[PDB]
Amino acid sequence: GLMQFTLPVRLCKEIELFHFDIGPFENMWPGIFVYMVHRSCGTSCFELEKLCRFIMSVKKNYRRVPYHNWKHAVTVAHCMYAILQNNHTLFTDLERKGLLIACLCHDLDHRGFSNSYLQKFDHPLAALYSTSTMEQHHFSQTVSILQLEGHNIFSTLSSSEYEQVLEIIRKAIIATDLALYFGNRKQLEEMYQTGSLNLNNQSHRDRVIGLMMTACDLCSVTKLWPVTKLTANDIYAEFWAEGDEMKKLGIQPIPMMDRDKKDEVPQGQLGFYNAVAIPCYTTLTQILPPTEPLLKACRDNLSQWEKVIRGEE
Ligand SMILES: O=C(Nc1ccn2nc(-c3ccccc3)nc2c1)c1cc(Cl)nc(NC2CC2)c1
Ligand SMILES: [Mg+2]
Ligand SMILES: [Zn+2]
């Protein structure tokens, strides 16, 4: 009860910033997550013993893939932590509990392959879940781990509070399906601009949490340039492996996933910043002004990719 997690001074200060990098010491990531839960939620939100057992079972159920791994889980949870800490009064007690857990769990048991690849491969998960294939799997893995003995971090919640938090987690994880992001953001844009956005409307909160989930999930593009640049290598290592597997099925992959088209990566990153990233952090900044640093960092990185094209690096 009186046992606080504390970080070294540089981490204690920089963990509060949006652009924080959790570092290469894997053994410190559990403690970093617990630190964030304790400051974001409270030392009373979760039984430390159950939380620690939950975190380590979640770690175990992330795979050794180049990008969609345990480091991505904690990175996305830290971005959520930064959003929640900069928007103290906007979120309920259940939302703060659910969302850090949702982020830690959002890519559970990811194989490094897109929903498209599972569908073209005819993977069993594609017959079980026709849309948002991997995201419904991630939620399924989350419920499975929550039901392991001594793993129920929500056991002190009432029957209906428990159902509400698992519903927050489900919607939050489904929302990380980038196919659903485009329509979610357009609706939020219209709602904010016609002035109809209402944070007491549950369907409206859902949409806003969805966009936060997209923002945290994409947060590699909101880091300092050396982090963003080196993370891109991991992202494309997965894409190119999927491109290879598409070629094994007798299907020319999209250029994004073709390792023969590495030269077109800088222009491909521009498209992504302009079509996905900037629009995402812009609408997020309109709804939640204190998330402006994410939009600023994203714009800085767009400018760095422009410099790559111009041969200035
Ligand atoms: O970089 C990312 N996305 C993109 C999107 C479109 N294109 N198009 C190209 C391209 C087009 C022509 C020639 C060469 C390359 N490259 C990309 C990269 C990215 C970043 C983060 Cl942070 N997350 C995710 N997440 C999803 C994986 C689930 C994805
Ligand atoms: Mg995912
Ligand atoms: Zn993710």
Side-chain angles (χ1 to χ4, degrees):
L2 292 180
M3 279 193 206
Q4 292 311 259
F5 281 68
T6 62
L7 306 173
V9 166
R10 189 198 61 85
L11 280 76
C12 179
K13 295 191 194 178
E14 262 111 309
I15 196 166
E16 295 309 321
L17 308 187
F18 284 101
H19 60 266
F20 181 61
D21 178 274
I22 64 174
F25 302 100
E26 300 202 1
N27 295 160
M28 288 182 74
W29 299 339
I32 287 164
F33 185 75
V34 172
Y35 182 84
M36 288 188 303
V37 170
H38 283 176
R39 283 188 99 258
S40 224
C41 195
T43 66
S44 48
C45 285
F46 301 120
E47 213 249 282
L48 187 48
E49 193 187 307
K50 292 187 156 204
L51 180 59
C52 282
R53 208 157 28 238
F54 180 85
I55 290 168
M56 295 311 291
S57 291
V58 174
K59 175 189 166 79
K60 183 199 299 168
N61 283 285
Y62 275 93
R63 295 177 177 265
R64 296 193 177 100
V65 291
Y67 177 70
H68 283 100
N69 53 37
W70 175 233
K71 192 181 190 157
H72 171 67
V74 179
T75 293
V76 168
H78 161 268
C79 193
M80 184 57 77
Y81 167 80
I83 293 174
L84 292 173
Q85 286 309 256
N86 279 271
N87 295 278
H88 183 65
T89 68
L90 279 93
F91 301 99
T92 66
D93 300 26
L94 279 178
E95 286 170 346
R96 287 205 254 77
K97 283 182 183 185
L99 284 174
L100 293 170
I101 297 294
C103 287
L104 193 69
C105 291
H106 82 284
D107 270 330
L108 262 167
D109 191 40
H110 206 289
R111 326 297 175 106
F113 297 115
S114 67
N115 289 336
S116 260
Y117 176 69
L118 285 206
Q119 296 154 18
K120 271 148 200 172
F121 184 78
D122 202 4
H123 194 280
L125 291 176
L128 184 59
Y129 311 121
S130 34
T131 61
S132 299
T133 302
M134 283 305 312
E135 294 79 20
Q136 299 202 58
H137 182 58
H138 303 316
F139 178 66
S140 189
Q141 295 280 284
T142 305
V143 174
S144 288
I145 292 177
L146 272 170
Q147 284 173 170
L148 268 22
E149 272 207 349
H151 284 62
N152 207 289
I153 58 170
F154 293 126
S155 65
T156 69
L157 273 50
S158 72
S159 183
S160 80
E161 280 187 301
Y162 185 97
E163 173 146 15
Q164 284 174 76
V165 77
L166 260 291
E167 199 56 12
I168 293 168
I169 290 164
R170 189 185 62 77
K171 290 168 182 164
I173 292 182
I174 298 305
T176 60
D177 180 5
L178 208 64
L180 297 176
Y181 151 70
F182 300 98
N184 188 48
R185 191 204 62 86
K186 285 155 189 155
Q187 284 285 175
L188 280 171
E189 197 61 12
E190 291 171 12
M191 279 172 190
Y192 164 84
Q193 286 184 335
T194 74
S196 49
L197 189 58
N198 172 23
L199 289 167
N200 302 327
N201 183 331
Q202 184 58 56
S203 65
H204 285 197
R205 290 188 83 69
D206 291 353
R207 287 204 176 275
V208 167
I209 293 155
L211 186 71
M212 288 158 66
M213 289 299 299
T214 307
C216 300
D217 195 22
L218 292 195
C219 77
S220 146
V221 302
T222 72
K223 305 305 184 187
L224 299 195
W225 171 241
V227 176
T228 297
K229 184 186 166 186
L230 288 162
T231 308
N233 290 338
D234 299 331
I235 298 177
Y236 280 101
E238 294 202 357
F239 289 165
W240 294 335
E242 180 166 326
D244 292 353
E245 291 301 325
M246 288 288 195
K247 288 176 196 174
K248 290 186 192 169
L249 291 176
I251 312 172
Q252 259 300 124
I254 67 187
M256 180 187 327
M257 290 176 193
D258 192 347
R259 62 173 75 253
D260 296 330
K261 305 191 176 163
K262 303 211 183 188
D263 38 298
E264 300 164 51
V265 160
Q267 195 60 46
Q269 285 291 298
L270 284 202
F272 183 77
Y273 278 76
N274 285 315
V276 188
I278 302 291
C280 172
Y281 296 112
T282 301
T283 305
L284 185 62
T285 296
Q286 292 171 179
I287 301 167
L288 302 182
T291 69
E292 187 183 355
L294 291 170
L295 175 50
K296 178 188 173 300
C298 186
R299 276 203 186 283
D300 288 339
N301 281 318
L302 171 53
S303 162
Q304 289 303 289
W305 284 110
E306 276 162 354
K307 287 171 171 155
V308 175
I309 293 173
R310 297 196 301 258
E312 299 159 44
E313 48 168 32

